[PDB]
Amino acid sequence: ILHRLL
Amino acid sequence: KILHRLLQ
Amino acid sequence: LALSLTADQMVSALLDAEPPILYSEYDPTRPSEASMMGLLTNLADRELVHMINWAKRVPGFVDLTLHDQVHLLECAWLEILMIGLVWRSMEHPGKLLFAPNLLLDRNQGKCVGMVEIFDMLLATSSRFRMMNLQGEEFVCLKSIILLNSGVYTDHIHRVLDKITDTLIHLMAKAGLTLQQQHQRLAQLLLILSHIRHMSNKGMEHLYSMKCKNLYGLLLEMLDAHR
Amino acid sequence: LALSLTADQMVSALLDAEPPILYSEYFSEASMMGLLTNLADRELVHMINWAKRVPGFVDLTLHDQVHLLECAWLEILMIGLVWRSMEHPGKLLFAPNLLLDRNQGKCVEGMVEIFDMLLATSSRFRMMNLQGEEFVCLKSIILLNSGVYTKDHIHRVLDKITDTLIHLMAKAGLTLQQQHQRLAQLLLILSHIRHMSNKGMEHLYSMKCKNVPLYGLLLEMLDAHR
């Protein structure tokens, strides 16, 4: 998710 | 306690 | 890129980067441990989204690989939420301003063993208030956190060096002697060691709140620390 | 009393206060843990004596002394360990007859992560060319600073040590920009050291929950971090 948003 | 005694 | 910024420009880019202050869904009719933590975790989860977009705008950050960006944020996320919290609470002696509609004193922390983290946060807010921390210095410290917390765990170091140059430049401009710039510089960076301590404690407290019944991003960031 | 000292006399009082390097008794999980806890229990007795000789420390009340030492003790053992290991890259020098590599850290579960972080710190000190004079200044800073937020005198003495650090950096020829940059780099490492001490405290308490036996000084110091 963090990966995604970044 | 022990600590108390070493600090004096 | 970030290396060719001047002190004023570093300060302008950081002040302009700042995320909004968010409101909680605090219903002051509605009386709980589950709901209080629910209000705080809902807030933190919305703040995590703005933090991710704030981190992108910190000079130097987007020059990192995805992996590393992910890493630095995994280490730093609670520390950054905590210093943001402590900073908005500066002018409320004895209180934490979770949001403009959610101002809690330490008795309301008993509702959850969260009172130990509360007091720590209160005493950091007091520390900031004694030293009369400035908005410009605060945004430097928050960027130092993001960049430093996970670094040990090169380009990053050059950028950290520039932010130190900026801090010293804020302090020369504020009328401080050479001797006083360096002392203030030490005291400001010594607080970050206390911030790191409160983040390790808060992590432990969070983990055991889940392991005895959280969201997506928040649970994810929590699990990063094992 | 402390405050009347010049930067040169601060350095000499600190260098002279240094504890001696202790030997281990002359590997499974429990035999290794036994060696390290016995060693750590003995080094604790000398740390209490080094503390009494740190200028400004004897001026504090007894319970304040106790508070500082209970907050700071594992960070202080860690930074001494880190300093002795500087010239053995790859390895941790626990005692001169007990130099361990990364791979031996696996004989204890949960230890490998703590080993790696200690190795990264020593590696970082090595690449900053940390000198013995700066090291003694950092060790003192950790004792005065780690528990100060859980006073004006303590802050006055930390201000004294910062001046001592800058005085050391100016004696070594570094420019003004390099001096504040270097001061920053050194204090930011204290925040990693606080982080290691927190992973280390948890690790020790769960070791206590299994059964290496923990008694005496070492047990008391660990219990102090509830």
Author numbering:
A (entry chain C): 689 to 694
B (entry chain D): 688 to 695
C (entry chain A): 306 to 336, 338 to 418, 420 to 460, 473 to 532, 536 to 548
D (entry chain B): 306 to 331, 337 to 460, 472 to 532, 534 to 548
Manuscript excerpt for this entry:
The estrogen receptor α (ERα) is a ligand-activated nuclear hormone receptor and a major regulator of cell growth, survival, and metastasis in a large fraction of breast cancers. Structurally, ERα LBD is an α-helical bundle, with the C-terminal helix, H12, functioning as a key structural component of the activating function-2 (AF-2) cleft that governs the agonist or antagonist state of the receptor. The Y537S and D538G mutations are especially interesting because they occur at the N-terminus of Helix 12 (H12) in the ERα ligand-binding domain (LBD). Importantly, breast cancer cell-based studies revealed that the Y537S and D538G mutations conferred hormone-independent activation of ERα and reduced the inhibitory potency and efficacy of clinically prescribed SERMs and SERDs.
